[PDB]
Amino acid sequence: SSFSFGGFTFKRTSGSSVKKEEEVLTGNLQTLKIRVHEGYEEFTMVGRRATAILRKATRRLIQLIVSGRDEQSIAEAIIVAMVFSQEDCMIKAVRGDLNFGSGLNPMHQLLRHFQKDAKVLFQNWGIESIDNVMGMIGILPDMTPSTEMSLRGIRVSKM
Q1: Which of 112, 105, 53 is nearest to 81 (CA)?
Q2: According to the 3-state scheme, what is the secondary structure of the chain?
Q3: Distance CA 113, CA 147 (A)
């Protein structure tokens, strides 16, 4: 109902999920046992420097809106959401092997990997054209703003 992930507090505002153990193959053909969230869920994510709303389904990010203090704050939230979505394109953007600590499950391994360098994640996520929505703007895989295109399913609040 409320939990923390990647430094953000997630509050479920709609839906539900169940957790199912599934093996997945990373971009480096490493096998991870991840606890997959199955179901449709809406969440508020609250961090110290950014807030976001996320709508997602099983291994699928549907919508993310991010409001952040600066560009780096926004990127952090986007990475967290993209990892939390458990999308195949995220799993396959992993480069090299992930090392297997006490204190780390596979979801936190994924997160630490992409926090280190998210270029491949962003490059493989996908982009789309957007509509003009008052108070909203797109953000590109290079983290620059656009009024015309954005990362798939992702928008930035100007406030």
Answers
A1: 53
A2: CEEEECCEEEEEEEECCEEEEEEEECCCCCEEEEEEEECCEEEEEECCCEEEEEEEECCEEEEEEEEECCHHHHHHHHHHHHHHCCCHHHHCCCCCCCCCCCCCCHHHHHHHHHHHCCHHHHHHHCEEECCCCCCEEEECCCCCEECCEEECCEEEECC
A3: 30
Resolution of the experimental structure, in angstroms: 1.5
Question: Domain extents for the chain?
Answer: 1-159
Cβ atoms of 140 and 151 within 8 Å: the answer is yes
- Structure tokens that stand for 67 in this block: 């409001």
Rounded Cα distance, 103 and 96, in Å? 20
Angle formed by the axes of helices 71-84 and 106-116, to 10°? 150
Contact 138, 150 (CB under 8 A): yes
